[PDB]
């Protein structure tokens, strides 16, 4: 399948080269997989989701995304225009309030929630979780990411927006999950992407068009916008049969565009997510 005049990041992760605007992908498009967006919530009523998105948990007084962040990230995973994995089932977990603030203990609660809940859902092609959030190093926050990953959920985390080595941030520094930095449409590491040997992969994160609440769209920027490219990609690769939840971060790295970003410090991977679908 081909989707012309696509947001640049979907064209990028289907291409070897920057400067193209068509997104290519096999039409299965993540059918039969499940992605949990653990964030401010998802405006599931957005027609872009077509009935495939459900809130399933909140730790606050409403499960609605009253911020916009969770809805944008979820749209990159799996909205019909703006998504990678256009036939995946989405699930929301509101661990962030509406300003974007969550305590670690509730974040943790969300995470263990997914390791359990997946067993209430039909995900025969595989389970993913997408965490576009974080704060300073915590062993506990990190342990809750290793558990979620160990439980057979592909875990994708934002490396962080401080232009700092990410080993000091959580859940980014955790080893066993897939820590995502960001790039721009000219293949520059993004000016705000954390970096550091704990990264596995880079994805589009500067000027990412996606859904927003009210039924709307906007372009925003972050390792948060890069993260759900890799989560949706992993859903797409599960569904095909290329990899598994426990093997997907390695498979994506093995199949990445290798050498191609500027602005990658010494010691940080120079790997860019790629679906290998057109070449
Ligand atoms: Ca890893």
From Swiss-Prot:
Annotated S-S bridges: 34-123, 178-249
Active site residues of this protein: 39 (charge relay system), 69 (charge relay system), 224 (charge relay system)
Segments traversing the membrane: none
Binding site for Ca(2+) 1: 175, 177, 200
A Gene Ontology BP annotation from the UniProt entry: proteolysis
Alphabetical UniProt keywords: Calcium, Disulfide bond, Hydrolase, Metal-binding, Protease, Serine protease, Signal, Zymogen
Positions annotated to bind Ca(2+) 2: 16, 260
EC number(s) recorded for this UniProt protein: 3.4.21.64
Positions of the Peptidase S8 domain: 7-279
Family label: Belongs to the peptidase S8 family.
Protein name as it appears in the record: Proteinase K
Organism from which the protein derives: Parengyodontium album
Gene that encodes it: PROK
């Amino acid at each position: 399948a081909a989707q012309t005049n696509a947001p640049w990041g979907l064209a990028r992760i289907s291409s070897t080269s920057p400067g193209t605007s068509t997104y290519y992908y096999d039409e299965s498009a993540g059918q039969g997989s499940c992605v949990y967006v653990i964030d401010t919530g998802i405006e599931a009523s957005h027609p872009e989701f077509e009935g495939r998105a459900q809130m399933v948990k909140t730790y606050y007084y409403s499960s609605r995304d009253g911020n916009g962040h969770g809805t944008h990230c979820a749209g990159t995973v799996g909205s019909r225009t703006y998504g990678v994995a256009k036939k995946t089932q989405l699930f929301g977990v509101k661990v962030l309030d509406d300003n974007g603030s969550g305590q670690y203990s509730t974040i943790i609660a969300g995470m263990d929630f997914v390791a359990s809940d997946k067993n209430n859902r039909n995900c025969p092609k595989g389970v993913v979780a997408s965490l576009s959030l974080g704060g300073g190093y915590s062993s506990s926050v990190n342990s809750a990411a290793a558990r979620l990953q160990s439980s057979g959920v592909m875990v994708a985390v934002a490396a962080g927006n401080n232009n700092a080595d990410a080993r000091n941030y959580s859940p980014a520094s955790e080893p066993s999950v897939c820590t995502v930095g960001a790039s721009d449409r000219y293949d520059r590491r993004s000016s705000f992407s954390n970096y550091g040997s704990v990264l596995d992969i880079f994805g589009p994160g500067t000027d990412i068009l996606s859904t927003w609440i009210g039924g709307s769209t906007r372009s925003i920027s972050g390792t948060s916008m890069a993260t759900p490219h890799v989560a949706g990609l992993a859903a797409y690769l599960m569904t095909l049969g290329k990899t598994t939840a426990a093997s997907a971060c390695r498979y994506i790295a093995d199949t990445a565009n290798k050498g191609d970003l500027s602005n990658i410090p010494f010691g940080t991977v120079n790997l860019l997510a790629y679906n290998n679908y057109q070449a």
